[PDB]
């Protein structure tokens, strides 16, 4: 019922679970030309690894499970991140790995383009909307915000 | 390590939580010209609503929480579904709504292009890969399949 | 509504990694009774049963690679009559078959299901193992015709 | 490695989610003659409904989500409950319905015969083991109890 | 490794829907003591406190729309010192703030946190409310330098 | 609506996940003088460590994941435990570590003072309420207990 405009130059969040970090570094390397045209941001460890392995400049927030997940989530809700690339691990996710559901649900709340694997990431990155504005329909949350609060 | 080729004409799964079903129907409607080039399959209620509201032909499996989730997951694992559009509800998901994590985890296992909202779906559908072959890198599970089994 | 389990059962056999040897021993101890039925298993569990015991077991994919969903589909299609799922309540691994989603579908369709060997022993000892059994199943017609909200 | 012997006269826990309570009452009624040979115990509301509808004597602990789940779990761990009949709701489980996983995991820990639907309950109740001793194999938890405790 | 809470605290106030009136009554009962500190809340909770009590509270977004993460970010950045989170253990709604994710981050950073009014009363009665408090923070140096698997 | 009175001499549960056990022991050691004025109870492994390392008397129930969690939860619901100190591990919780959610939700049900980290525990222990009676407001569950049970 409402609209969010993604700008022409995107801010792209880059996050990987530990067992997918090398996969994400390889994906960034293969798409370095396209990705470095945009603003890149990452959780602490993923971002340090991209910089150490590739020399690609990426803004870093805290490590995911130490608050980086919430920092990126805050920026999504504040319309400061436009695209999320999150390689999560469906087989060997570790106790400290970023929480998958909580991270993805906020992207759905705000109708943010989001990839959870490299095939989706390839489709997203190849879209012409990478380089234009994109008008994302969002739910009108005004009714939710004005909801009646129970007495008990 | 291993590579899977998505065919030019895709099989696209269509699934929506109850509070997103109308959104998915409108999304299918606005992309009908592009979508009818592909094979469409859906959970029972979602597929029935698409067919009744739009007259668009969709193969229907069982209702999601009655087993349709597992039927579509089986087809994903069997490489019979190439793209998944799953509009799930991040705010008002009902007790009977299809389990989000278990469904999308299997897409990640097999590196399936997958959208959880209409913005991701628009990016996927606008990709040139929508109408050409796409080579998806598949994780190697040979080590996992040959893993040591504990004694107790 | 009513479902009828056939005389000869189709029995799914699934174990978490730390319970696989227990499941193999259970199949070995009950081999005479079990091989009268159709046995099906996730990939690794079925491979282990066939290699360790020489008992014939149809194998689907490994549980976390899709085998869970393949067996779940057969449960929902009433092609599996009995589920034996030894899951690990103490050291379940990141890749172990997800417990809730697998057993919730048995409850949906009122499928006999064991989650440990004591339940499996009680199920296998029932006279219903080798005869037909008529199970009451929940009525889902109202659910299937439910009103769909506008947003 | 270790053995736990169930006595000839069993203690049977009876628990149902709200939308399965009438099903459980009908099941108890159908098996009342067999069940009253044993010791029956139930969560607060379930037991109240059984006594009120059927006149069958059932010991009652607190309501499930108010602590009754933990009271029954304590008795399972203390070998004071031998069989568990838990009709939980796979479709319309309510916010307050007894947490399924936590309850049944303890039954699995101690290898307790347990039914989650009436078909399993019918198979269990028809076992000859209902009326005899039954030797249940349990894991030896001594190694776990003596495990190395990490320094940090 | 020691973090110092200042004398004047920043206190987050959050409640699930069926606990909002309880939190408002609690804030009301302790208004004199609480307004000595910096109060911050999720959107609806803070709106309710201001509308019902006239107590000044900085408001972030609604919890499930991102407010949970905004407060979590501030916790991780040591900008919130005390968290009062009345969550609903019986009738939590589909949109209610994610309990585990919210309180986990307080545990990560050893933040004083209340999940019910009794804990909130104990926290507010502490002499540490109005003095500095030295909080031990877990060492994450080993975690931050952990080896990253090849796949 | 209802009121629960904590007595001046408290019963305090002490529980730690494995990677937090040394932290909890060190915390008990720093507060031993104040704590030994009260009735201390713990899960099996945690309690054994406190007794052996500190010479502090602690009643021990079973190990947490073997039923000790439910034993303490039962006592919480029966108002036999007044304060809960539960150092759980937000980073490296193991498969066998005590279920965090189920344990703390029951403390919230009965409005039990509860600490999940040492800073909260320090605030609780410094409270003037530690050594006096304290009246806790508890939700009235009478309406919940008398709720209508659905027919299907």
Automatic annotation (TrEMBL), chains A, B, D, F:
Its EC number is 4.2.3.3. Catalyzes the formation of methylglyoxal from dihydroxyacetone phosphate. It comes from the Bacteria. This is Methylglyoxal synthase. Keywords: Lyase. It catalyses: dihydroxyacetone phosphate = methylglyoxal + phosphate. Substrate binds at residues 17, 21, 43-46, 63-64, 96. PANTHER family: METHYLGLYOXAL SYNTHASE. GO terms for biological process: methylglyoxal biosynthetic process. One of its GO terms (molecular function) is methylglyoxal synthase activity. The active site is at 69 (proton donor/acceptor). Belongs to the methylglyoxal synthase family. One of its GO terms (cellular component) is cytosol. PROSITE patterns: METHYLGLYOXAL_SYNTH (PS01335), MGS (PS51855). Residues 4-152 form the MGS-like domain.
UniProtKB/TrEMBL annotation, chains C, E:
It comes from Elizabethkingia anophelis NUHP1. PROSITE patterns: METHYLGLYOXAL_SYNTH, MGS. Residues 3-151 form the MGS-like domain. The active site is at 68 (proton donor/acceptor). HAMAP family: Methylglyoxal_synth. InterPro entries: Methylgl_synth, Methylglyoxal_synth_AS, MGS-like_dom, MGS-like_dom_sf. Substrate binds at residues 16, 20, 42-45, 62-63, 95. Keywords: Lyase. Belongs to the methylglyoxal synthase family. The gene is mgsA. This is Methylglyoxal synthase. Its EC number is 4.2.3.3. One of its GO terms (biological process) is methylglyoxal biosynthetic process. One of its GO terms (cellular component) is cytosol. Catalyzes the formation of methylglyoxal from dihydroxyacetone phosphate. One of its GO terms (molecular function) is methylglyoxal synthase activity. It catalyses: dihydroxyacetone phosphate = methylglyoxal + phosphate.
């Amino acid at each position: 019922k409402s609209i969010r405009t993604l700008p022409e130059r995107k801010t792209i969040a880059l996050v990987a679970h530990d067992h997918k970090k090398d996969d994400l570094v390889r994906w960034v390397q293969k798409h370095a030309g396209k990705l470095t045209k945009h603003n890149l941001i990452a959780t602490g460890t993923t971002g340090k690894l991209i910089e150490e392995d590739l020399g690609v400049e990426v803004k870093r927030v805290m490590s995911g499970p130490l608050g980086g997940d919430q920092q990126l989530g805050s920026m999504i809700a504040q319309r400061q991140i436009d695209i999320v690339i999150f390689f999560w691990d469906p087989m060997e996710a570790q106790p400290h790995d970023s929480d998958v559901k909580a991270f993805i649900r906020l992207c759905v709340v705000w109708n943010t383009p989001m990839a959870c694997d490299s095939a989706t990431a390839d489709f997203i990155l190849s879209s012409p909307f990478m380089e234009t504005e994109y008008q994302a329909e969002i739910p009108d949350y005004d009714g939710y915000l004005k909801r009646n609060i129970p007495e008990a």
